[PDB]
UniProtKB/Swiss-Prot annotation, chain A:
<comment type="similarity">
    <text>Belongs to the MCM family.</text>
</comment>
<protein>
    <recommendedName>
        <fullName>DNA replication licensing factor MCM6</fullName>
    </recommendedName>
</protein>
<comment type="function">
    <text>Acts as a component of the MCM2-7 complex (MCM complex) which is the putative replicative helicase essential for 'once per cell cycle' DNA replication initiation and elongation in eukaryotic cells. The active ATPase sites in the MCM2-7 ring are formed through the interaction surfaces of two neighboring subunits such that a critical structure of a conserved arginine finger motif is provided in trans relative to the ATP-binding site of the Walker A box of the adjacent subunit. The six ATPase active sites, however, are likely to contribute differentially to the complex helicase activity.</text>
</comment>
<feature type="modified residue" description="Phosphoserine">
    <location>
        <position position="66"/>
    </location>
</feature>
<comment type="subunit">
    <text>Component of the MCM2-7 complex. The complex forms a toroidal hexameric ring with the proposed subunit order MCM2-MCM6-MCM4-MCM7-MCM3-MCM5; loaded onto DNA, forms a head-head double hexamer. Interacts with MCM10.</text>
</comment>
From Swiss-Prot, chain B:
<dbReference type="GO" id="GO:0031298">
    <property type="term" value="C:replication fork protection complex"/>
</dbReference>
<dbReference type="GO" id="GO:0000727">
    <property type="term" value="P:double-strand break repair via break-induced replication"/>
</dbReference>
<dbReference type="GO" id="GO:0071162">
    <property type="term" value="C:CMG complex"/>
</dbReference>
<dbReference type="GO" id="GO:0031261">
    <property type="term" value="C:DNA replication preinitiation complex"/>
</dbReference>
<dbReference type="GO" id="GO:0016887">
    <property type="term" value="F:ATP hydrolysis activity"/>
</dbReference>
<dbReference type="GO" id="GO:0006270">
    <property type="term" value="P:DNA replication initiation"/>
</dbReference>
<keyword id="KW-0547">Nucleotide-binding</keyword>
<comment type="similarity">
    <text>Belongs to the MCM family.</text>
</comment>
<keyword id="KW-0235">DNA replication</keyword>
Length: 156, 597, 478
DNA sequence: CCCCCCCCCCACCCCCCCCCCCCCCCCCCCCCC
DNA sequence: GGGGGGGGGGGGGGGGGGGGGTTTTTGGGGGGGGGG
């Protein structure tokens, strides 16, 4: 992310992002008085392709026909949209906690309303909770090109 | 002159508690428990002089595993520890932490006192847990009251559902924004003890530490909803339920529908009026914080496999309470064994139907095979008493029907004549392909049912007419009826030479107390585990000539495929690894009996 | 005098707030017991000296900074942490009382009131209790000036030896006849039906399974008014339940709160008891399959919402069913007259077709009986003295536990009687003899043997059980 | 076997918080003993 | 040469201001069952 201050035209840049939309706390200009009044520079900042996909336990792997357990997988960049609804897939990547970003404090959002953890200064009186999600860096499926060249030139 | 470490509110010394537990966790002998319990004369030194918990810790350490089960009555059997039982019941978390630490100290001290070499670093790295159980009477969920609010209790009930695993933070991980220094903070009573200033005195910036969520260390928590068992309810009101919290390797100790016991500390906590405020409601949520959970051979196998009368012996043993229907019993035994699978699909299922008069033993026969089979089901051809035959989409979720639930087991269907037409169509692809095709809500799959069906069907009206064919008596259509390997008729036609002996056999059950009825399931299990028959080359010619014989007499290849599967099942019986000529001959003979109906 | 008077809920005007009043009603629902705080106790980490907060309100705010002078006089901002062990909780329970059907004025909704009960008085109230509760009628702020209001309970008044006292009836004698007549004593005749209905309560003998349950269906006209007979014997049994076909178990979530529960149906309430299925011909297929599983396995299964179970249902089924087109034609089959399927009817141990036949004899007696009830507001004198329900429960329990053994003489006789019956079966109707009817004869004669408190079953018991079966079979034709 | 029916499922005060101002405390520097 | 006093900076506390806080009917499609 990258932000320009409201009361002076100076720019903060390469601002790393937490799970909440993260804005700078101090102005880099030693003259300036600003804290927390900013405009995001959409052109200088960099986004990434992002896609959540929900997966459920394989039908042939459930032990006695009870409910399948589910998980949220995040795909990013070149790996997005390789999944498909009803496809059977193998992913690899990072098992991660994702906080309740509303409870963590968020611009323009009133917080949400299991016992969380509290005392952290950002929360004040609030208590933070976490989902598990899987940040997948790679995907494959495990469950018409009608021109001669585009077919032949893929073969061994 | 020195400080004392006390269990707060009790004046119990933790050194005393520690040593009282140690001198039982080592040097206890199992003989003492029989002194406490009934039948004390069953003490036997050659089995009961064992240092029981030294034995447990040795097997546990060879497995490297963290958990010890502890029947709490064993504390009351031992003189230096009977007081520790009361401290365990009344002040459980402190005593349990002390017991955990003592187990770890016993593991450490054993590899330097018994002094065999071991990875001390492994034990140092590992946590250890005691699991006390059988703490006391299983007092009712409805009987709990606020005196219990910190005691170790015992409950019994039914699991309705459980959450997925919930990550519970055990150590927060903080990083300094300015200087990138990092420090670990243990979570204390659920509260993050945030550092206000950076630890490094050469930096010491205020408010600069930030929490790095995915570098924290998390324990596993799970919440499970336990319903009051209908054994305990008063008749005129709903059952209660209690939420229970369960942690680490005790996660997924049980699943939906399990009847269980739990031993756990009864706990309570306040809950908020609104998340943006500290304000708490004046009456607490209650839950139980569990520490133990519990539900609710080859020599003889080979010896019996040597017998010559084994086919008849096992067949009569499936239902010896039922008067003679012996070819039905033989067919159902062969169905229990089943054929074999192959990769390329052709599979080991065998399928049977019983028709004839309604008021006869066929229902009991279905019940007995249901009791015998490891993972089968009982159902009837239509409707749903919260259990139905077909897979079905409902709220959005796919539910698996009784056929699909009977994967790898016998599916017993009564009222098979009165079955509904959509179900009659659905049976074709499980009969042929052992699957059912699903194509809704973005999910497409052939849901594999892999079940042998034992059907029970009836004539139209009160009586079967044997002067008319099966298709004329029965409701269900011939192409479905054709798929069954063996099809049988059981009839109530009067004959005193049968009826009198049936009645005497039936009535004698009220007076009387070879029939390996309880060994039958073990024989079936080991046969299905170990034996995978292949067809002998001579048995090819036997199958071909038998098939062409019955073809010269309206057969189809389905009959030949059936004879193959029955011969393979006949070879699992007697634990024979290759199908013999006699196996083909009996499969042929029994099918020749069946196809004549 | 005001605490003495039993007000209805709508008579509790706002003027009674703060006063100790007594309210008369029926408890419509009750909460599970929960711990309310009286005094919260806080440990202090940085001085050890605990501090306390008394709570007088629906909500409270937790303390943080240590107010104790051990900290405060040293200006040490130590931290307070709540402790359950040192806190005084009190048992709390919320109930709701509703005014009775006689208290509701014409055309009004029955009004209701929250009851808060604390301390030892907890779980003195059950749903369905009709009760006088004394308490302090009080407000609670949430509306603005409108108040929530409740009754702080103070006192409860409910509106509603055997192993030797049973010998009173044993020595009094003629026990089977008199106890049979005592089922619905005002109901004329049908003493064969009443004699069969008793053998549900005492049951047969179970053995390793062989089953003790006995099942009966009361078919035929609705003008016999069989529902009252089901009501009567339901009240006799110590564990039974009355129901309508208009039964299956289900995961009946969202009962009051949006909340998970499994509903065991009436067939599970009737575990080790009688399920009285009125309007039996009207039931739907889910209930038909439920009845099928309990009548065969004595279980009812679930495969729903991930829950996969079998609930215990060792239950005896008493059923009553009525014909299509209002009135039964005797020349036609029960299968022609009634909606039920034949395979299900075959599983009952006794089948009684109690028709209603007009009669210059019977109708005068029924008319005089009914008109006596209208003219004197009570039933006429019975020409005999009945046994009351709680007193016959002594006998029924004594007969239940005194299970007999079979005898060789009875074995030979039941075989011979059964074969005699199979000769008539060789011919009409579904009422022919089967192995299940032989099991019925055995179970019913065992029930008679239990009723006479014997150690063995008798050919006397067999011939009476056979008479009941034969009478029931003949009832299917008239 | 075909068509029609009918059944099912679905849509204004109080607390937390943040900012601003004032005073006090602690350190450093300079002078005095 | 060390200790006291004066002066300046920095931190903490207190006060003040502000903002937030489910059944019942109607219509439609699809599936299942019954009658000619
Ligand atoms: Zn700026
Ligand atoms: Zn730092
Ligand atoms: Zn303190």
């Amino acid at each position: 992310a990258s932000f320009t201050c409201d009361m002076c035209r100076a720019i903060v840049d390469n601002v790393e992002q937490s799970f909440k939309y993260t804005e700078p706390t101090f102005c880099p200009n030693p003259s300036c008085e600003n804290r927390a009044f900013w405009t995001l520079n959409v052109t200088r900042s960099r986004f990434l392709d992002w896609q959540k996909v929900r997966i459920q336990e394989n039908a042939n792997e459930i032990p006695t026909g009870s409910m399948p357990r589910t998980l949220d997988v995040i795909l990013r960049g070149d790996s997005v949209e390789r999944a498909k609804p009803g496809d059977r897939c193998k992913f690899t990547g990072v098992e991660i906690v994702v906080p309740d970003v509303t409870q963590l404090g968020l611009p323009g959002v009133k917080p949400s309303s299991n016992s969380g953890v509290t005392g952290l200064r950002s929360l004040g009186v609030r208590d933070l909770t976490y989902k598990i999600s899987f940040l997948a860096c790679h995907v494959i499926s495990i469950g018409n090109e009608r021109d001669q060249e585009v077919f032949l030139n893929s073969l061994s | 002159s020195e400080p004392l470490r006390i269990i707060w509110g009790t004046n119990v010394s933790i050194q005393e508690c520690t040593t009282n537990f140690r001198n039982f966790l080592m040097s206890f002998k199992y003989k003492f428990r029989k002194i406490l319990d009934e039948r004390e004369e069953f003490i036997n030194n050659t089995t009961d002089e064992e240092l029981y918990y030294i034995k447990q810790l040795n097997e546990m350490r060879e497995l490297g595993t963290s958990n010890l089960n502890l029947d709490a009555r064993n504390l009351l059997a031992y003189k230096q520890t009977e007081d520790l039982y009361h401290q365990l019941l009344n002040y459980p978390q402190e005593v349990i932490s002390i017991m955990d630490q003592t187990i770890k100290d016993c593991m450490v001290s054993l590899i330097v006192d018994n002094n065999l070499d071991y990875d001390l670093d492994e034990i140092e790295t590992k946590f250890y847990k005691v699991r006390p159980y059988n703490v006391g009477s299983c007092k009712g969920m409805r009987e709990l009251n606020p005196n219990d609010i910190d005691k170790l209790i015992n409950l019994k009930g039914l699991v309705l559902r459980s959450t997925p695993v919930i990550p519970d933070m055990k150590v927060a991980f903080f990083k300094c924004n300015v200087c990138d220094h990092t420090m670990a903070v243990e979570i204390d009573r659920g509260v993050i003890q945030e550092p206000a200033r950076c630890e490094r005195i050469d930096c010491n910036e205020p408010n600069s530490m930030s929490l790095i969520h995915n570098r924290c260390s998390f324990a596993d928590k799970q919440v499970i909803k336990l319903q009051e068992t209908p054994d305990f309810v008063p008749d005129g009101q709903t059952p209660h339920s209690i939420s229970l919290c369960v942690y680490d390797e005790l996660v997924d100790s049980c699943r939906a529908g399990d009847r269980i016991e739990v031993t756990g500390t009864f706990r309570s906590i306040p809950i908020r009026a609104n998340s943006r405020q500290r304000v708490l409601k004046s009456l607490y949520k209650t839950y139980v914080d569990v520490v133990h959970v519990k539900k609710v051979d080859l020599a003889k196998i080979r010896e019996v496999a040597a017998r010559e009368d084994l086919y008849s012996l096992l067949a009569r043993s499936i239902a010896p309470s039922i008067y003679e229907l012996e070819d039905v019993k033989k067919g159902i035994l062969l169905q229990l064994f089943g054929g074999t699978n192959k990769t390329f699909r052709y599979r080991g299922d065998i399928n049977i139907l019983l028709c004839g008069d309604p008021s006869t033993s066929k229902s009991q026969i279905l019940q007995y095979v249901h009791k015998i089979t490891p993972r089968g089901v009982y159902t009837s051809g239509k409707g749903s008493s919260a259990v139905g035959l077909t897979a079905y989409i409902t709220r959005l979720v796919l539910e698996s029907g009784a056929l699909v639930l009977s994967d790898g087991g016998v599916c017993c269907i009564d009222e098979f004549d009165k079955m509904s037409d959509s179900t009659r169509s659905v049976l074709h692809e499980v009969m042929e392909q052992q699957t059912i095709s699903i194509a809704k809500a973005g999910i497409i799959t052939t849901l594999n049912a892999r079940s042998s069906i034992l059907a029970s069907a009836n004539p139209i009206g009160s009586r079967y007419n044997p002067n008319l064919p099966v298709t004329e008596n029965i409701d269900l259509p011939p192409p479905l009826l054709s798929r069954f390997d063996l099809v049988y008729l059981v009839l109530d036609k009067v004959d005193e030479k049968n009826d009198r002996e049936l009645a005497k056999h039936l009535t004698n059950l009220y007076l009387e107390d070879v029939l390996p009825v309880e060994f039958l399931t073990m024989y079936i299990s080991y046969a299905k585990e170990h034996i995978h028959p292949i067809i002998t080359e001579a048995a090819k010619t036997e199958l071909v000539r038998a098939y062409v014989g019955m073809r010269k007499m309206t057969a189809t290849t389905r009959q030949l495929e059936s004879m193959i599967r029955l011969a393979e099942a006949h070879a699992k019986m007697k634990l024979k690894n290759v199908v013999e000529l006699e196996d083909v001959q009996e499969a042929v003979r029994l099918i020749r009996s069946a196809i004549k109906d | 005098a005001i605490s003495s008077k039993p007000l209805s809920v709508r008579q509790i005007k706002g003027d009674f707030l703060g006063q100790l009043i007594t309210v008369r009603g029926i408890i419509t629902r009750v909460s599970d017991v929960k711990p309310a705080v009286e005094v919260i106790a806080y440990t202090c980490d940085q001085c050890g000296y605990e501090v306390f907060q008394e709570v007088n309100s629906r909500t409270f705010t937790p303390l943080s900074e240590c107010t104790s002078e051990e900290c405060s006089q040293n200006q040490t901002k130590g931290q307070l942490f709540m402790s359950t062990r040192a806190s005084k909780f009190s048992a709390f329970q919320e109930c709701k009382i509703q005014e009775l059907s006689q208290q509701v004025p014409v055309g009004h909704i029955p009004r209701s009131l929250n009851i808060h009960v604390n301390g030892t008085l907890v779980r003195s109230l059950s749903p369905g209790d009709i009760v006088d509760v004394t308490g302090i009628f009080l407000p609670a702020p949430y509306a603005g000036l409108l108040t929530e209001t409740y009754l702080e309970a103070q006192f409860v008044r409910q509106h509603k030896d055997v192993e030797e006292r049973v010998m009173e009836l044993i020595t009094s004698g003629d026990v089977y006849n008199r106890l049979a007549k005592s089922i619905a004593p005002e109901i004329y005749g049908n003493l064969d039906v009443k004699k069969a209905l008793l053998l549900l309560l005492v049951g047969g003998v179970d053995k390793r399974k062989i089953r003790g349950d006995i099942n009966v269906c009361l078919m035929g006209d609705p003008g016999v008014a069989k529902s009252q007979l089901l009501k009567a014997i339901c009240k006799i049994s110590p564990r039974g339940v009355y129901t309508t076909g208009k039964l299956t178990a289900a995961v009946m979530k969202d009962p009051v709160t949006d909340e998970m529960i499994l509903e065991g149906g009436a067939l599970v309430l009737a575990d080790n008891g009688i399920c009285c299925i009125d309007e039996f011909d009207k039931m739907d297929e889910s209930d038909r399959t439920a009845i099928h599983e309990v009548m065969e396995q004595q279980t009812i299964s679930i495969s729903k919402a991930g829950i996969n179970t079998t609930l215990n249902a060792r239950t005896s089924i008493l059923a009553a069913a009525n014909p299509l087109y209002g009135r039964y034609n005797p020349r036609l089959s029960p299968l022609d007259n009634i909606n039920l399927p034949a395979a299900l009817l075959s599983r009952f141990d006794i089948l009684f077709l109690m028709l209603d036949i007009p009669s210059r004899d019977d109708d005068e007696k029924l008319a005089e009986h009914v008109t006596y009830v209208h003219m004197h507001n009570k039933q006429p004198d019975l020409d005999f003295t009945p046994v009351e329900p709680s007193k016959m429960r002594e006998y029924i329990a004594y007969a239940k536990t005194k299970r007999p053994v079979m005898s060789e003489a009875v074995n030979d006789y039941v075989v011979q009687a059964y074969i005699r019956l199979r000769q008539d079966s060789k011919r009409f109707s579904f009422g022919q003899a089967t192995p299940r009817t032989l099991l019925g004869i055995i179970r019913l004669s065992q029930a008679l043997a239990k009723l006479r408190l014997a150690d063995m079953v008798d050919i006397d018991d067999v011939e009476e059980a056979l008479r009941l079966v034969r009478v029931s079979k003949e009832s299917l034709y008239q």
